[PDB]
Design a protein around this ligand. Structure first.
Ligand SMILES: [Mg+2]
Ligand SMILES: [Mg+2]
Ligand SMILES: [Mg+2]
Ligand SMILES: [Mg+2]
Ligand SMILES: [Mg+2]
Ligand SMILES: [Mg+2]
Ligand SMILES: [Mg+2]
Ligand SMILES: [Mg+2]
Ligand SMILES: [Mg+2]
Ligand SMILES: [Mg+2]
Ligand SMILES: [Mg+2]
Ligand SMILES: [Mg+2]
Ligand SMILES: [Mg+2]
Ligand SMILES: [Mg+2]
Ligand SMILES: [Mg+2]
Ligand SMILES: [Mg+2]
Ligand SMILES: [Mg+2]
Ligand SMILES: [Mg+2]
Ligand SMILES: [Mg+2]
Ligand SMILES: [Mg+2]
Ligand SMILES: [Mg+2]
Ligand SMILES: [Mg+2]
Ligand SMILES: [Mg+2]
Ligand SMILES: [Mg+2]
Ligand SMILES: [Mg+2]
Ligand SMILES: [Mg+2]
Ligand SMILES: [Mg+2]
Ligand SMILES: [Mg+2]
Ligand SMILES: [Mg+2]
Ligand SMILES: [Mg+2]
Ligand SMILES: [Mg+2]
Ligand SMILES: [Mg+2]
Ligand SMILES: [Mg+2]
Ligand SMILES: [Mg+2]
Ligand SMILES: [Mg+2]
Ligand SMILES: [Mg+2]
Ligand SMILES: [Mg+2]
Ligand SMILES: [Mg+2]
Ligand SMILES: [Mg+2]
Ligand SMILES: [Mg+2]
Ligand SMILES: [Mg+2]
Ligand SMILES: [Mg+2]
Ligand SMILES: [Mg+2]
Ligand SMILES: [Mg+2]
Ligand SMILES: [Mg+2]
Ligand SMILES: [Mg+2]
Ligand SMILES: [Mg+2]
Ligand SMILES: [Mg+2]
Ligand SMILES: [Mg+2]
Ligand SMILES: [Mg+2]
Ligand SMILES: [Mg+2]
Ligand SMILES: [Mg+2]
Ligand SMILES: [Mg+2]
Ligand SMILES: [Mg+2]
Ligand SMILES: [Mg+2]
Ligand SMILES: [Mg+2]
Ligand SMILES: [Mg+2]
Ligand SMILES: [Mg+2]
Ligand SMILES: [Mg+2]
Ligand SMILES: [Mg+2]
Ligand SMILES: [Mg+2]
Ligand SMILES: [Mg+2]
Ligand SMILES: [Mg+2]
Ligand SMILES: [Mg+2]
Ligand SMILES: [Mg+2]
Ligand SMILES: [Mg+2]
Ligand SMILES: [Mg+2]
Ligand SMILES: [Mg+2]
Ligand SMILES: [Mg+2]
Ligand SMILES: [Mg+2]
Ligand SMILES: [Mg+2]
Ligand SMILES: [Mg+2]
Ligand SMILES: [Mg+2]
Ligand SMILES: [Mg+2]
Ligand SMILES: [Mg+2]
Ligand SMILES: [Mg+2]
Ligand SMILES: [Mg+2]
Ligand SMILES: [Mg+2]
Ligand SMILES: [Mg+2]
Ligand SMILES: [Mg+2]
Ligand SMILES: [Mg+2]
Ligand SMILES: [Mg+2]
Ligand SMILES: [Mg+2]
Ligand SMILES: [Mg+2]
Ligand SMILES: [Mg+2]
Ligand SMILES: [Mg+2]
Ligand SMILES: [Mg+2]
Ligand SMILES: [Mg+2]
Ligand SMILES: [Mg+2]
Ligand SMILES: [Mg+2]
Ligand SMILES: [Mg+2]
Ligand SMILES: [Mg+2]
Ligand SMILES: [Mg+2]
Ligand SMILES: [Mg+2]
Ligand SMILES: [Mg+2]
Ligand SMILES: [Mg+2]
Ligand SMILES: [Mg+2]
Ligand SMILES: [Mg+2]
Ligand SMILES: [Mg+2]
Ligand SMILES: [Mg+2]
Ligand SMILES: [Mg+2]
Ligand SMILES: [Mg+2]
Ligand SMILES: [Mg+2]
Ligand SMILES: [Mg+2]
Ligand SMILES: [Mg+2]
Ligand SMILES: [Mg+2]
Ligand SMILES: [Mg+2]
Ligand SMILES: [Mg+2]
Ligand SMILES: [Mg+2]
Ligand SMILES: [Mg+2]
Ligand SMILES: [Mg+2]
Ligand SMILES: [Mg+2]
Ligand SMILES: [Mg+2]
Ligand SMILES: [Mg+2]
Ligand SMILES: [Mg+2]
Ligand SMILES: [Mg+2]
Ligand SMILES: [Mg+2]
Ligand SMILES: [Mg+2]
Ligand SMILES: [Mg+2]
Ligand SMILES: [Mg+2]
Ligand SMILES: [Mg+2]
Ligand SMILES: [Mg+2]
Ligand SMILES: [Mg+2]
Ligand SMILES: [Mg+2]
Ligand SMILES: [Mg+2]
Ligand SMILES: [Mg+2]
Ligand SMILES: [Mg+2]
Ligand SMILES: [Mg+2]
Ligand SMILES: [Mg+2]
Ligand SMILES: [Mg+2]
Ligand SMILES: [Mg+2]
Ligand SMILES: [Mg+2]
Ligand SMILES: [Mg+2]
Ligand SMILES: [Mg+2]
Ligand SMILES: [Mg+2]
Ligand SMILES: [Mg+2]
Ligand SMILES: [Mg+2]
Ligand SMILES: [Mg+2]
Ligand SMILES: [Mg+2]
Ligand SMILES: [Mg+2]
Ligand SMILES: [Mg+2]
Ligand SMILES: [Mg+2]
Ligand SMILES: [Mg+2]
Ligand SMILES: [Mg+2]
Ligand SMILES: [Mg+2]
Ligand SMILES: [Mg+2]
Ligand SMILES: [Mg+2]
Ligand SMILES: [Mg+2]
Ligand SMILES: [Mg+2]
Ligand SMILES: [Mg+2]
Ligand SMILES: [Mg+2]
Ligand SMILES: [Mg+2]
Ligand SMILES: [Mg+2]
Ligand SMILES: [Mg+2]
Ligand SMILES: [Mg+2]
Ligand SMILES: [Mg+2]
Ligand SMILES: [Mg+2]
Ligand SMILES: [Mg+2]
Ligand SMILES: [Mg+2]
Ligand SMILES: [Mg+2]
Ligand SMILES: [Mg+2]
Ligand SMILES: [Mg+2]
Ligand SMILES: [Mg+2]
Ligand SMILES: [Mg+2]
Ligand SMILES: [Mg+2]
Ligand SMILES: [Mg+2]
Lengths: 124, 138
RNA sequence: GGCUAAUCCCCCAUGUGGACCCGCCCCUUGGGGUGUGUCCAAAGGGCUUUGCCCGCUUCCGGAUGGGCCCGCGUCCCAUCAGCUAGUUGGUGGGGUAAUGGCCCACCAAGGCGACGACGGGUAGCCGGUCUGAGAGGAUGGCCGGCCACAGGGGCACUGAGACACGGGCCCCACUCCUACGGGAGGCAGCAGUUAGGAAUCUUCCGCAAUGGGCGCAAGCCUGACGGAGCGACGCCGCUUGGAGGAAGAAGCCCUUCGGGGUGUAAACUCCUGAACCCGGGACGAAACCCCCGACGAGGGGACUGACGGUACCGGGGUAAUAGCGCCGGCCAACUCCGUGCCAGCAGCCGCGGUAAUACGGAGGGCGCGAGCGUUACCCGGAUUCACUGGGCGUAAAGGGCGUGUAGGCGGCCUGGGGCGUCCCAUGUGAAAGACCACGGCUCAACCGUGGGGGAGCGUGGGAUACGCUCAGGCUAGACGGUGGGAGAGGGUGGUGGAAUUCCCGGAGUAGCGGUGAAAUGCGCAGAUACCGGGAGGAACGCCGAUGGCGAAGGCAGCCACCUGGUCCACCCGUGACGCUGAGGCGCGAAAGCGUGGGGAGCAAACCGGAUUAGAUACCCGGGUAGUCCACGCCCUAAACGAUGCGCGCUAGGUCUCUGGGUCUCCUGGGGGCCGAAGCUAACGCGUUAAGCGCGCCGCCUGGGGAGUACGGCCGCAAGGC
RNA sequence: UUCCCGGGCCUUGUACACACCGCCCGUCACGCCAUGGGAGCGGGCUCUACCCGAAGUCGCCGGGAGCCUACGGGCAGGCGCCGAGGGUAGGGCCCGUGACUGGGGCGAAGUCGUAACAAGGUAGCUGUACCGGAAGGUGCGGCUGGAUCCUUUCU
């Protein structure tokens, strides 16, 4: 474009969309499960993936993944939502956070425990 | 019509050199002649003269090259390896004195046209003035 | 209703001076002087009361604080294109400290807008901050500056100052009081409660310091403030020991059963001595006051801590917290077991469907370390909005073509000006931050002191190359003159032949037609094939090209008139009159729409015949709109060179059309093909650029959703932009 | 040497590359997210015309119609303009809700066709137009971004 054209028109700054309406921008929101369920993954894999539909304090309702192995959660559990998607499942944009609220940590889990919300094992 | 005569000089020169001519006629004006004076002084051209062509006056810019070469491509190095306009009609450019540019870490130039006359980079610094930044050459 | 004091209120007086009307002078927007006329002051209190301190009045200047006004800068949407009645100016007037439609009456009919008015969306702004190599992007928490608001809306009073957060009136919502009449509230002040949320502290100490209000002072007030408490929220310092100690215990790990690993790690040896115990124990603090001198200066001169018995100095003294992520690649770190498309992992690529360095533990390893990971958000990377710094022949991207408005851009020579541009001087660019240096807490973080820098804007001075500009030349661009050319360029009328169809006539039988084969259809009302005559419509064989003309779409018989563009020669005329072109306006294949004609052949739809597994298709036979014309709409396209216009530069060779030449050839101007240099991802391009440059317009920014939705505008509709 | 099969060499087109026992398009069915439209409803706001109008400032009255008076005037009170807001009648504005529905886009993967890629078996694409609810057929015109000089599906 000429310069007179850049003066006339000028470059367009570029917007972006938030891959997450947790809305509120907040780093997490609290919400209450509706469905706790399983689903069938996308094409390249096969498995049973545990997930909860949730009502969120944001006036917002979403399927959210339940990471770890052992999960307790049921239809009235109240849980804290994380953000991050499960690439092979449909419509799950967020993660549940273990150890917080009703979702408890992964029991028997010795290795990556910041994630998975599991306290430290004792020793003698 | 011709449109930026000074670009058109520098260009006539760029082409001329790449096809290795001995000389070229750029149609003439005191400003081009001044641009050239500086080129000669600085060692880029051999020199230039004023000629007439079917009556209408030009400038022969005689051209400088490297010596001949080794292997495939005997074509000699260029003396003006690079020539380009900077200020143009439609975007004019002016440097203050403290903005005048270091061209190829000094081995090239910048023709500034100042209120003191047309000078090189260093020439303007040592002179202490700013101007319309015409081209860089190297 | 009644009493009464004052530095409360009022009236005379004095007039230093001041206000105001009219005159004069100077100055120049309402600045200053002056004359006359008019109007204007005051408060007392305390002492050692004979003199001073505290105040009071009118004025002049100062200082500091502000009001108002102007240039410039200050986000997204044009799917917001028009907005405007005090609205735009004026005269008089009200108001104010003061200009002002700020307000009011009367008069004019203006003001604003693509240089984005109006509308809608978001938003306190800046100093600065984060990010970035920079340009730039993002942001504006704390500290400093300005603004604005104090439950929502309106309003004024008081005052130097407010339209007043802890002042007042009214309306509205809500909480509380209520003898139902009516009243009371206003933490976005320090704490604290409550809700909401992912989440954000103590209803602490102190007036010692600093600052502020009142006070002659003593002194009161101060949730400003100085401190303490809470939370790894951030930064910075610090500890979890130091040295010696196996050719290397045990356990645990692999193992090729030889061994390798954990690992100098531990045990143990020895030394220091975080915590903690003991004593001392701050600066911050010298004023206000005291006295002498005169309540000055000067001089001495004593009282005054929240933090705190804290920081710190001395003494004594104990081996005395480690965690978190990660180890398939990007990426530093690999092995065994377990699970077997499960359980799970997952930022992207992609792991797991029996040997998994990717899942889960374990050994070991890497990275950090009182942290370490996660999510969210910002910049970076991203030269992926490209000013620095990108593109559009086939990748996304040249607008279908043109005319031409605003706008952008502008050959050569000289002169004036000096607006851009440049230089110097100076003002400004607060402080804090940032950069430099030194210093203060044992260091740093943190702080102080000094230095330096700085775009921008004010003023003064200066330069004149380029850019503006004004005046004057020029002729190389552009236009013109004359003479000559080629052409399916356009419009209008005419007219020629071939062919088809049809009708008439003659002659002549038994089929014709059509296909891979067939059938439908036609044919004894005599078709086909043949000869002659007529009617009508549409299209123009050969020439014809690898050709020409046009801006594009597009344009073919011949003739004449009307008419556009264009090339060459001559070098004659004007004298930069130029290029581009958002908006506009006009053209714009075919199909399609309206009205009216026309209708030979062809032919969407349709009817039939075949064919196939079915046929709705290809193939056959019929056939309607339509194709043609006039006029009026529609405005699309592979509207193709998938290549915007103009100009300048950069080997040649070859074929051609068409001018001019001294016509083996040269020289303009078109059309092609090869190929310099160069470009290009490649293919290709290559004086008919996709090369090298400059100007201006159009356009692009992953695929699908989709040229969809919605809004607008056009259109008769179809549908278009 | 035409044909059937298997093969060698050059060349050409290609969207195939587990390579034509390849690719792939659409329809109906079925499982998901999200959109428009959407009648009315619930409500927030703003504009205009009219109407009612608290406070308060200003303006006028301020009268043998009140209070003060030094008769100069002052206050009370009255009326008025302006006016926060309220009601009445229509234009948009945004949010919420929604009977009704439009396709959509992947997604288990079934359904019948074979439209495109090889001259995809009728060369393809294309603006349009009529048809078939299937890819689609056909008409007119255009493009080359087309190969080489009866039919016959799928894996
Ligand atoms: Mg699978
Ligand atoms: Mg010379
Ligand atoms: Mg530049
Ligand atoms: Mg009384
Ligand atoms: Mg009383
Ligand atoms: Mg008084
Ligand atoms: Mg008096
Ligand atoms: Mg006097
Ligand atoms: Mg005067
Ligand atoms: Mg007097
Ligand atoms: Mg008195
Ligand atoms: Mg004063
Ligand atoms: Mg001022
Ligand atoms: Mg402004
Ligand atoms: Mg009005
Ligand atoms: Mg008025
Ligand atoms: Mg006035
Ligand atoms: Mg303007
Ligand atoms: Mg706001
Ligand atoms: Mg902001
Ligand atoms: Mg930096
Ligand atoms: Mg960068
Ligand atoms: Mg950038
Ligand atoms: Mg900024
Ligand atoms: Mg900002
Ligand atoms: Mg602020
Ligand atoms: Mg602040
Ligand atoms: Mg200010
Ligand atoms: Mg308010
Ligand atoms: Mg409140
Ligand atoms: Mg209010
Ligand atoms: Mg006062
Ligand atoms: Mg006032
Ligand atoms: Mg206020
Ligand atoms: Mg309060
Ligand atoms: Mg009250
Ligand atoms: Mg709560
Ligand atoms: Mg605090
Ligand atoms: Mg104090
Ligand atoms: Mg005293
Ligand atoms: Mg008090
Ligand atoms: Mg404090
Ligand atoms: Mg924490
Ligand atoms: Mg630290
Ligand atoms: Mg040791
Ligand atoms: Mg061992
Ligand atoms: Mg010891
Ligand atoms: Mg002291
Ligand atoms: Mg002290
Ligand atoms: Mg003292
Ligand atoms: Mg004394
Ligand atoms: Mg003293
Ligand atoms: Mg003293
Ligand atoms: Mg004191
Ligand atoms: Mg103490
Ligand atoms: Mg000690
Ligand atoms: Mg000791
Ligand atoms: Mg130890
Ligand atoms: Mg690695
Ligand atoms: Mg993992
Ligand atoms: Mg196994
Ligand atoms: Mg294994
Ligand atoms: Mg395997
Ligand atoms: Mg592993
Ligand atoms: Mg991994
Ligand atoms: Mg692992
Ligand atoms: Mg480990
Ligand atoms: Mg952290
Ligand atoms: Mg980024
Ligand atoms: Mg650029
Ligand atoms: Mg720049
Ligand atoms: Mg690009
Ligand atoms: Mg393509
Ligand atoms: Mg393209
Ligand atoms: Mg084009
Ligand atoms: Mg196009
Ligand atoms: Mg033009
Ligand atoms: Mg113009
Ligand atoms: Mg010029
Ligand atoms: Mg100047
Ligand atoms: Mg300065
Ligand atoms: Mg500073
Ligand atoms: Mg500081
Ligand atoms: Mg500092
Ligand atoms: Mg130091
Ligand atoms: Mg100046
Ligand atoms: Mg001069
Ligand atoms: Mg000049
Ligand atoms: Mg001069
Ligand atoms: Mg100009
Ligand atoms: Mg002239
Ligand atoms: Mg002449
Ligand atoms: Mg002529
Ligand atoms: Mg013609
Ligand atoms: Mg005939
Ligand atoms: Mg007959
Ligand atoms: Mg007969
Ligand atoms: Mg028959
Ligand atoms: Mg019959
Ligand atoms: Mg018969
Ligand atoms: Mg019959
Ligand atoms: Mg005949
Ligand atoms: Mg007829
Ligand atoms: Mg005839
Ligand atoms: Mg022909
Ligand atoms: Mg054509
Ligand atoms: Mg002609
Ligand atoms: Mg001639
Ligand atoms: Mg002449
Ligand atoms: Mg002349
Ligand atoms: Mg146009
Ligand atoms: Mg048309
Ligand atoms: Mg037509
Ligand atoms: Mg029709
Ligand atoms: Mg018609
Ligand atoms: Mg008709
Ligand atoms: Mg026919
Ligand atoms: Mg037919
Ligand atoms: Mg049929
Ligand atoms: Mg078949
Ligand atoms: Mg049939
Ligand atoms: Mg019809
Ligand atoms: Mg027509
Ligand atoms: Mg271009
Ligand atoms: Mg000739
Ligand atoms: Mg042509
Ligand atoms: Mg040529
Ligand atoms: Mg040629
Ligand atoms: Mg070529
Ligand atoms: Mg080459
Ligand atoms: Mg290039
Ligand atoms: Mg060119
Ligand atoms: Mg290119
Ligand atoms: Mg577009
Ligand atoms: Mg997309
Ligand atoms: Mg798109
Ligand atoms: Mg369309
Ligand atoms: Mg819309
Ligand atoms: Mg529409
Ligand atoms: Mg309509
Ligand atoms: Mg259409
Ligand atoms: Mg419509
Ligand atoms: Mg064979
Ligand atoms: Mg062989
Ligand atoms: Mg092909
Ligand atoms: Mg190939
Ligand atoms: Mg395959
Ligand atoms: Mg096949
Ligand atoms: Mg299917
Ligand atoms: Mg729905
Ligand atoms: Mg009223
Ligand atoms: Mg009233
Ligand atoms: Mg009035
Ligand atoms: Mg009276
Ligand atoms: Mg009254
Ligand atoms: Mg009213
Ligand atoms: Mg096919
Ligand atoms: Mg087809
Ligand atoms: Mg085909
Ligand atoms: Mg077929
Ligand atoms: Mg066919
Ligand atoms: Mg059909
Ligand atoms: Mg068609
Ligand atoms: Mg065709
Ligand atoms: Mg093609
Ligand atoms: Mg199939």
């Amino acid at each position: 474009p000429t310069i007179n054209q850049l003066v006339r028109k000028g470059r367009e700054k570029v917007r972006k969309k938030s891959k997450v309406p947790a809305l509120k921008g907040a780093p997490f929101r609290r919400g209450v499960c509706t469905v706790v369920r399983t689903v069938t993954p996308k094409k390249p894999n096969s498995a049973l993936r545990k997930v909860a539909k949730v009502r969120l304090t944001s006036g917002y309702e979403v399927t959210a993944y339940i990471p770890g192995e052992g999960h307790n959660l049921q239809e009235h559990s109240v849980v804290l939502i994380r953000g991050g998607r499960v690439k092979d499942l449909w419509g799950v944009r967020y993660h549940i956070v273990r150890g917080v609220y009703d979702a408890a940590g992964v029991k028997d889990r010795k290795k990556s425990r910041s994630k998975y919300g599991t306290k430290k094992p004792k020793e003698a | 019509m011709l449109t930026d005569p000074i670009a058109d000089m520098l260009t006539r020169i760029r082409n001329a050199t790449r096809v290795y001519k001995e000389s070229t006629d750029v149609p003439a004006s005191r400003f081009k002649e001044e641009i050239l004076r500086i080129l000669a002084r600085e060692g880029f051209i051999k020199g230039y003269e004023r000629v007439d062509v079917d009556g209408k006056p030009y400038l022969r810019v005689y051209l400088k090259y490297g010596p001949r070469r080794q292997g495939p491509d005997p074509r000699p190095e260029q003396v003006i390896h690079h020539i380009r306009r900077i200020s143009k009609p439609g975007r004019r450019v002016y440097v203050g004195v403290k903005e005048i540019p270091r061209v190829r870490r000094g081995l090239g130039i910048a023709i500034l046209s100042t209120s003191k006359g047309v000078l090189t980079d260093r020439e303007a610094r040592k002179l202490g003035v700013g101007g319309e930044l015409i081209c860089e050459v190297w």
